[PDB]
Curated annotation (Swiss-Prot), chains A, B:
Organism: Human immunodeficiency virus type 1 group M subtype B (isolate BH10) (HIV-1)
Domain of life: Viruses
Coiled coil: none
Protein's UniProt name: Protease
Assembly behavior: Homodimer, whose active site consists of two apposed aspartic acid residues.
Signal peptide: none
Active site: D25 (for protease activity)
Biological function: Aspartyl protease that mediates proteolytic cleavages of Gag and Gag-Pol polyproteins during or shortly after the release of the virion from the plasma membrane. Cleavages take place as an ordered, step-wise cascade to yield mature proteins. This process is called maturation. Displays maximal activity during the budding process just prior to particle release from the cell. Also cleaves Nef and Vif, probably concomitantly with viral structural proteins on maturation of virus particles. Hydrolyzes host EIF4GI and PABP1 in order to shut off the capped cellular mRNA translation.
Designated gene of the protein: gag-pol
The Peptidase A2 domain, residue ranges: 20-89
Positions of the UniProt region annotated as Dimerization of protease: 1-5, 49-55, 88-99
Length: 99, 99
């Protein structure tokens, strides 16, 4: 679809058999999700942004659906205030900025 | 222009008679720029990122150019690791998501 930005660009994703709402984030290189139940093995990792850094877990090759479009990528779980879909995923569903 | 997302969406802004490189961030309610000389009054204010909170100065009605398009809005100056253009401004140059 086409998304104007007068309202946070919130979409609906389904990961690990759960439904959630992530923010479409161009400024994010990575996909970061609040604490959640995900199967498989993972890695410790740290990412940073405004205000500081946070230690998160890294999951690769995990299936995720973003507002209808399927995609398989790297999801990072950890103490982020909101769900974020980053360019690593935004790239797969062919998302783009236009103006 | 249709900015694809395989590389961070960096664009050229011009504020305070100075040129800078900022990130086009859809997941950003506000525009935040690293420390810089900016004329006019302001108001202290804290904002929260993925890592925590930061105290930034808030300037209003500050003319700015993003990739050639003139816009006037609220700009926040503070300890942000990157220059960020937020939805408050993106909507001013007609920037939108699409996929
Ligand atoms: C009250 C509270 N309100 C809140 C609001 O909660 C939010 C809401 C959104 C975000 C995401 C973040 N935005 C952001 O800091 O925006 C700020 C400017 O105005 C305000 O509006 C929203 C929060 C705040 C960027 O869009 C992506 N980032 C890159 C920029 C900032 C450099 S990153 O740090 O998150 C990131 C993500 C993934 C990455 C990465 C970096 O590097 C590699 O992968 C963070 C906290 C929290 S507590
Ligand atoms: K979905
Ligand atoms: K999976
Ligand atoms: K410019
Ligand atoms: K001005």
């Amino acid at each position: 679809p086409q998304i104007t930005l007068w309202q946070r660009p919130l979409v609906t994703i389904k990961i690990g058999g759960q439904l959630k709402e992530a923010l479409l984030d161009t400024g994010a290189d990575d996909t970061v999700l609040e604490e959640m139940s995900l199967p498989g093995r993972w890695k410790p990792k740290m990412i940073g942004g405004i205000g500081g850094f946070i230690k998160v877990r890294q999951y690769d090759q995990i299936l995720i659906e973003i507002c209808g479009h399927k995609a398989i990528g790297t999801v990072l779980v950890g103490p982020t205030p909101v769900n974020i879909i980053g360019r690593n995923l935004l790239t797969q569903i062919g998302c783009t900025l236009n103006f």
